[PDB]
Amino acid sequence: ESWAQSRDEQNLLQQKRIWESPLLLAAKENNVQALYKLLKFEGCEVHQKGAMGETALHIAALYDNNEAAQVLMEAAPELVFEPMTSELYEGQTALHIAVINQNVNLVRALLARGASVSARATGSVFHYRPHNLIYYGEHPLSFAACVGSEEIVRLLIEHGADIRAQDSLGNTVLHILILQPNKTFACQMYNLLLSYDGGDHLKSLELVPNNQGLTPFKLAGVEGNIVMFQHLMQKRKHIQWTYGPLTSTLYDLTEIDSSGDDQSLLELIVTTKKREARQILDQTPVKELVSLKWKRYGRPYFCVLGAIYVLYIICFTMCCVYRPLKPRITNRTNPRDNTLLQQKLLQEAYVTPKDDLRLVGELVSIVGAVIILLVEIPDIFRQTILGGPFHVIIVTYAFMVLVTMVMRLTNSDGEVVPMSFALVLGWCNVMYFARGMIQKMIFGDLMRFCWQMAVVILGFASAFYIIFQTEDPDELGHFYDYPMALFSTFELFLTIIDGPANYDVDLPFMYSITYAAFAIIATLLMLNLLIAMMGDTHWRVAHERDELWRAQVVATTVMLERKLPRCLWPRSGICGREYGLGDRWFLRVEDRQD
Amino acid sequence: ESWAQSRDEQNLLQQKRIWESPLLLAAKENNVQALYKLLKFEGCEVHQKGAMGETALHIAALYDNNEAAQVLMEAAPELVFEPMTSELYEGQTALHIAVINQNVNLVRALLARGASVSARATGSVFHYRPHNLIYYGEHPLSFAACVGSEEIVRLLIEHGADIRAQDSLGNTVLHILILQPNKTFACQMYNLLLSYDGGDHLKSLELVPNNQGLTPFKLAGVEGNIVMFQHLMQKRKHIQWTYGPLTSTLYDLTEIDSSGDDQSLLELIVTTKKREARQILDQTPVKELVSLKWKRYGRPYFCVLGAIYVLYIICFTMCCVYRPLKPRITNRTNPRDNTLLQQKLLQEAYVTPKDDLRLVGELVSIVGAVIILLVEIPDIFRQTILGGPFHVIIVTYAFMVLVTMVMRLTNSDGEVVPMSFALVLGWCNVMYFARGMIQKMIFGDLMRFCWQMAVVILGFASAFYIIFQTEDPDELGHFYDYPMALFSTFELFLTIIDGPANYDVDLPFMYSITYAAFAIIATLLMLNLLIAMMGDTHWRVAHERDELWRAQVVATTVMLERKLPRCLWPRSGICGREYGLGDRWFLRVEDRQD
Numbered sequence A, B: 001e002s003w004a005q006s007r008d009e010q011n012l013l014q015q016k017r018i019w020e021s022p023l024l025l026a027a028k029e030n031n032v033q034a035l036y037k038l039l040k041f042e043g044c045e046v047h048q049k050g051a052m053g054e055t056a057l058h059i060a061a062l063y064d065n066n067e068a069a070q071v072l073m074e075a076a077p078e079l080v081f082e083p084m085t086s087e088l089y090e091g092q093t094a095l096h097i098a099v100i101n102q103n104v105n106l107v108r109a110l111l112a113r114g115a116s117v118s119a120r121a122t123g124s125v126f127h128y129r130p131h132n133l134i135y136y137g138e139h140p141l142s143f144a145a146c147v148g149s150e151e152i153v154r155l156l157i158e159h160g161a162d163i164r165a166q167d168s169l170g171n172t173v174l175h176i177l178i179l180q181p182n183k184t185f186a187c188q189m190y191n192l193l194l195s196y197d198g199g200d201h202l203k204s205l206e207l208v209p210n211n212q213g214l215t216p217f218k219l220a221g222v223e224g225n226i227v228m229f230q231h232l233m234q235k236r237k238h239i240q241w242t243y244g245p246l247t248s249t250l251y252d253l254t255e256i257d258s259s260g261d262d263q264s265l266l267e268l269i270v271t272t273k274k275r276e277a278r279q280i281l282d283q284t285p286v287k288e289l290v291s292l293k294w295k296r297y298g299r300p301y302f303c304v305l306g307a308i309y310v311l312y313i314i315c316f317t318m319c320c321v322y323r324p325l326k327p328r329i330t331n332r333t334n335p336r337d338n339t340l341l342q343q344k345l346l347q348e349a350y351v352t353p354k355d356d357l358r359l360v361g362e363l364v365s366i367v368g369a370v371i372i373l374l375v376e377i378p379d380i381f382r383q384t385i386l387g388g389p390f391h392v393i394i395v396t397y398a399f400m401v402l403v404t405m406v407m408r409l410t411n412s413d414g415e416v417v418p419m420s421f422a423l424v425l426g427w428c429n430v431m432y433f434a435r436g437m438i439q440k441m442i443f444g445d446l447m448r449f450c451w452q453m454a455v456v457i458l459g460f461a462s463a464f465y466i467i468f469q470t471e472d473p474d475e476l477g478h479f480y481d482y483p484m485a486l487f488s489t490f491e492l493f494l495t496i497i498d499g500p501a502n503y504d505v506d507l508p509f510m511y512s513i514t515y516a517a518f519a520i521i522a523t524l525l526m527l528n529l530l531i532a533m534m535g536d537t538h539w540r541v542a543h544e545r546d547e548l549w550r551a552q553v554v555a556t557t558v559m560l561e562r563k564l565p566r567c568l569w570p571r572s573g574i575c576g577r578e579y580g581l582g583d584r585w586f587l588r589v590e591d592r593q594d
């Protein structure tokens, strides 16, 4: 039923065969005299494959038995080429085991016998899986780079190790170094592998991308390797001049911004689930980038698009507060008086006196809903909430408006259930537009509550109004007109009014549902306020409160750059073509030092 | 559409012209042989202005190319005098670039050729703007002082550098040092520039004020430079005697207190938006000052003025609780019974039995409102809330009282809307008078809540009473008389009473507005209490809670010293005239050392 049990069963099974096979046992214990008393007379199987398809040399290489390994090579030099014939270690040679163990003399001897420096260890243990503690790759050169042994690295290059070699996952020796825990020390090894590159501008090793379309520089950002990212940044920044403390450095800004449909560091950071990758935006070439993208273009277009959405939702409620109308007509208010409806449905509701003002208003609510779907539906085909569930709500709001239209033209009785959902989904999606020390942050987070509060009540008071605009105000008239309805709901937002409560009669199916959602949102905002009031002052967790919002702003800034056309929102940085720099866009960033 | 893009475009444009111009390129790369192969045959333009109006020497000075700069000076000595003819660096000479780079040999050579030590670099990059990383000034002497190179400082003084020189912003070399980040090291440079002063008591360099009326000593306080402030304080304090550990030092206390209409350190600290400047009050010459100003004179006059305001507001409500009276008269309570008013308006309300007791009370409410305007309106002409929005509320309260008077004499029906606003604005402005370890601070902040609570209810219960004194107590009688009204509102302050809630009838326009403000203030005080209960115990943020109140007390102490006459509130410190000290007021401060 599992897999980890198998390899745990095999390692125990391996030590069994070593304990049984006297050749393998002598290769483990480095019993030199027992190898001569076994290989010359009475010759035993020397190509003896153990439990993991290992030769006697593989066991002599696992335990760094140089004396025992040299006897196994002089009596049978063909053991050097032999790889592990198992499934867990398919491809691993005696050289791979000697490289990771940093056995320079055994590596020197294995290379002297002519070991393959291009052997791919494609075994299941060497995979990049969470159940494998190390990921070094496949080639023995890739092993030497990860163990930090610069001596074996160059010693393998001298015997024809291809640095351009990629594993099953399309990772070069450079990609794998970035996926190593020792970040500060891998920078030293990374520069060693680069020195053996072809030296030509074309076919560079740092440009060879991952199988998932990630150059090593780009992979460092997505993986959140801060030390590798800053190191690789040194090779793509030019210091313009030195003016005392000022150091105007010109950054590359090539693989850090968008033209790639999906290839761009910014998009890969805001859409990845990796918590460590969020720190990459904050680096000295990137933090200047998104800060310029939000000060200009970003913030104004977000509030311009906001004011357009505030007007589009207040118009939808303008057509709801004055919904269509005939009183009950039916005597159904006499039997089963528990239902006191004065239901209102309307078809030749063409009769126009002030009804065309709402009709053109209802037409705005329709043409705006399809436009919402014309910018979100073609976008789902090409989904990570960093930046708020605004997209999940904006598509379900337009769905309720279309259902209300489908509700219309058929004269259905349940015209309230799909229309009321659009009121809360339309308003509470406005509070997402709130993206525009402990003192001002308490006040800063308090203004988010004051914005999120007034938005919630304006969506539930308009809802509760429709829920009891048809019903009778004789009993339970908490929302008999709009001005009240807002005031009742506002007090209901603080639990001052006892909640529309009535059990003699019955009240529509939507009140027992809409009021249930209103009671939960009211406490979560008041719980999120307390955390915004205490979490802001407790400790520097206000920073943790802080870059989550900053990352939400960066995630929103990248969102506004995808759908907006090229005529608006010009490209960041400065193009290089005349003034001479080759048509990449560079960012001029200067810093003072103290 | 921006400006930072331009200079980013120009620096890229600069490197283009350097890359193109072989003379400028040779000046950058220090190509000595390429300068001789360009200047002697085949002579090229040597006065070649680059992209930023720079000469070949300016480029040879930017990159510290001494060998290349000396060839450009021997073949064309007129390049030394030439300044940058650009807009970004208008005025910068080859000496300015050699001073900041601390190139002593190039500075020695430029001075030997006779470079202007008084050249003002008035370029746009050298401005004191937030988009400029450094502000050093204009003169090359001011550059040497900011880079900490005391060798170039004296070397420039030897060639006639004027220390008395001011930039466009009227800043001497001393003002600029205070605006430098390296505070601990600028104190060393500051004493060097003072040694070259005229040595005369008159025309001292430390007395030359800013263009915005700030001596360097005064600027250190407004800017919050603690290291410079304590350093400059050493020269204006005299140790009276040494008595073992005791060291009675006599402080100057001249530029730290008021006679200057607006010139005084205290006023400049409490009115500036700079958060760092608040720490200056707390220094050892200033913290003793405001502490003496608040123990005596400050605290008593604040509570005396408080008790006068408590009586002035309780008298205004005394005339409201017994407002004027005729019942409805009209049959309008029969049709549209939704309005159950028993409206009360009165003109020959002269008829006097107990009505003169209120008339003289109404006369107090008028003569007091104009006095409030006679001490605040002439003060707005000569506005920062540090110390609470008491001034913003005290002027709008007196505005409502005057409107109520204008409401009167015309027999208007809306006599409640402007009168009720004065009840909450009159009381809730009292809680501002609350300025009078974790244990006693929890109790200290709890007594602020107990004071702010009882003040809010006494303003809203009196309001809610007037809102329903005219209305009918048959239905919704939460405030039928004053003793109740207080009790209902008190319970309403804790959300125990369901809130005056009624939907059958209608209730005046002021209840749906006054009760909305009452529900928000009730939760903010209870939210501010929780933070006062947890924030006080969490960590030493109670100190952060702490000096904000202390600064509010200091801001209030300076407020009480401006309007009070000279006969009250004597001047701080002790005058020097006979006993011999020259008519400045000194503060005697002694300290013990351990």
Ligand SMILES: C[C@@H]1NC(=O)N[C@@H]1CCCCCC(=O)O
Pocket (backbone or CB within 6 Å): A052, A054, A058, A059, A062, A089, A125, A126, A127, A132, A133, A134
């Ligand atoms: C010890 C085993 N014997 C052997 O000859 N090779 C194996 C080496 C084990 C390394 C497993 C690496 C991994 O966890 O992926």
Ligand SMILES: C[C@@H]1NC(=O)N[C@@H]1CCCCCC(=O)O
Pocket (backbone or CB within 6 Å): A241, A243, A246, B052, B054, B058, B059, B062, B089, B125, B126, B127, B132, B133, B134
């Ligand atoms: C490098 C430029 N070339 C040059 O000849 N002078 C400039 C010096 C730049 C300093 C900008 C100072 C500031 O940021 O205000």
Ligand SMILES: [Gd]
Pocket (backbone or CB within 6 Å): A474, A475
């Ligand atoms: Gd009833």
Ligand SMILES: [Gd]
Pocket (backbone or CB within 6 Å): B474, B475
């Ligand atoms: Gd009744």
